[PDB]
Write a protein that binds this ligand. Structure first.
Ligand code: AR6
Ligand code: AR6
Lengths: 176, 176
C-alpha cells in the first residue's frame, strides 16, 4: 500500500502540457525524445530505456547519422517503440533551445503528440528547477507563436518522482 | 490565448484518483454520479447537465424510483450518456458517507471507473475545502479496505475552475 501524486496537466493556448511519472519507453505517441551524449553514443539512463525498447536497427541508424554531418539533433524512426520517430538530443546543451527545436520539428512534420524526459537532469548534471523552467519557457513560446498547431499534446515523463513536484512548482507560476 | 491548470492525478493504493476541469456529461466511464435534491426532483447545476444529456427515459425512471421506497440514493441506467448507470445522490447529505456508498456500489457491481462532481458545493452550499477532504477521506478508506478492486479509476469533474486548486491542496496532504 502507498499514496502519491503521479500527474499534473495544464493548458497553454491550444497545447495540453502534461508532466507524469513513468518510463518513457512505454509511450504511445507520435514523437519520443531521447536525451543523450553530443556524439549520440550513450546507452545509460533514459537512452538505455529508449535504445533497448527501440531495437538494434534504430541503434545502428544512430551510428550512421552520428558519423555524418548533422544538426544538433538526429532523427530516426521508432523501431519497436510505439512511436513514429525518435529525436535524439544532447542533454548537455541549452534545454530551452533544444525543446524549441523539437517542437518546431514536430509541427513541421504535422505530428500531434510528443513525450520527452527531464532533459539534462541525470548524467548531464543540470539543475532540475532550471530545466523545468526552460522546458516550460519553450512550450509557452511555441504556443504563443502558433494559434492552431498540429502539435496539441506535450508530455514530460518523469522517472525520479522527486522531480514531479519541481515540475509542478514551475507550472503553477503560469496558472490563472 | 490563455494559461491554466486543468488536471491533477494521484495513486492511492490500487486506485487512480483524478481531479480535472470539465462537464461531467461528456464522461465516458462505467458510472456517473448526479448530485441532486433529497427528492431527486432537481434539474439545475450538475443535475441539468446530467438529466438533459441522459434523456427523458432516465428522467421518468427517476420519478418512479423516487416515489417508492429507496436507499439514500437511486440508480438508473445512463440513457444517452456514455455510461452504464447513473447514481443519484443527495448533495445535502454527509459527503464522505455518500461517496463511500457510491464506491461500494461500484465495486459490488464490478464496475471499473466512476466520475462524480464536487458534491454539495453548489446549491447545497457546503464548504468546498471540507467537501474535497471528505471525498478524499472516502477514497483512502475504500482503498485501504480493498487491495485488489475492480474499481480502479475515480474522477472528480470540476466545473468551477476555482475549486481545482482547493482539490489539489487536499490531495497534496496525502503525498509522499
Ligand atoms: N525510462 C526512463 N523514462 C523517462 N525518464 C528516464 C528514464 N530513465 C531515466 N530517466 C530520467 O532521464 C533524465 C535524464 O537522465 P540521463 O539519461 O542521465 O540523461 P541526461 O540528459 O542527464 O544526460 C545525457 C548526456 O547528456 C550530457 O551530455 C551528459 O554527457 C550525459 O551523458 C533523468 O531525470 C533520469 O532519471
Ligand atoms: N456540467 C457540470 N459538470 C460537472 N460539475 C458541474 C456541472 N455543472 C455544475 N457543476 C458543479 O456541480 C457542483 C454541485 O452543484 P449543484 O448542482 O448546485 O449540486 P449541489 O450538490 O450543490 O446541490 C444539489 C442539491 O442538494 C442539496 O440538497 C441542495 O438542496 C441542492 O439543491 C458545483 O460545483 C457545480 O459548479
Amino acid at each position: 500500500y502507498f499514496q502519491s501524486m503521479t500527474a499534473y496537466e495544464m493548458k497553454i493556448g491550444a497545447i495540453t502540457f502534461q508532466v507524469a511519472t513513468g518510463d518513457i519507453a512505454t509511450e504511445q505517441v507520435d514523437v519520443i525524445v531521447n536525451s543523450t551524449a553530443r556524439t549520440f553514443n550513450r546507452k545509460s539512463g533514459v537512452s538505455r530505456a529508449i535504445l533497448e525498447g527501440a531495437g538494434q536497427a534504430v541503434e545502428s541508424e544512430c551510428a550512421v547519422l552520428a558519423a555524418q554531418p548533422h544538426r544538433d539533433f538526429i532523427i530516426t524512426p521508432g523501431g519497436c517503440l510505439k512511436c513514429k520517430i525518435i529525436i535524439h538530443v544532447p542533454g548537455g546543451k541549452d534545454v530551452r533551445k533544444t525543446v524549441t527545436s523539437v517542437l518546431e520539428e514536430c509541427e513541421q512534420r504535422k505530428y500531434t503528440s510528443v513525450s520527452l524526459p527531464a532533459i539534462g537532469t541525470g548524467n548531464a548534471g543540470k539543475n532540475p528547477i532550471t530545466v523545468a523552467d526552460n522546458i516550460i519557457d519553450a512550450i509557452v513560446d511555441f504556443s504563443s507563436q502558433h494559434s492552431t498547431p498540429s502539435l496539441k499534446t506535450v508530455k514530460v515523463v518523469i522517472f525520479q518522482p522527486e522531480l514531479l513536484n519541481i515540475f509542478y512548482d514551475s507550472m503553477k507560476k503560469r496558472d490563472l
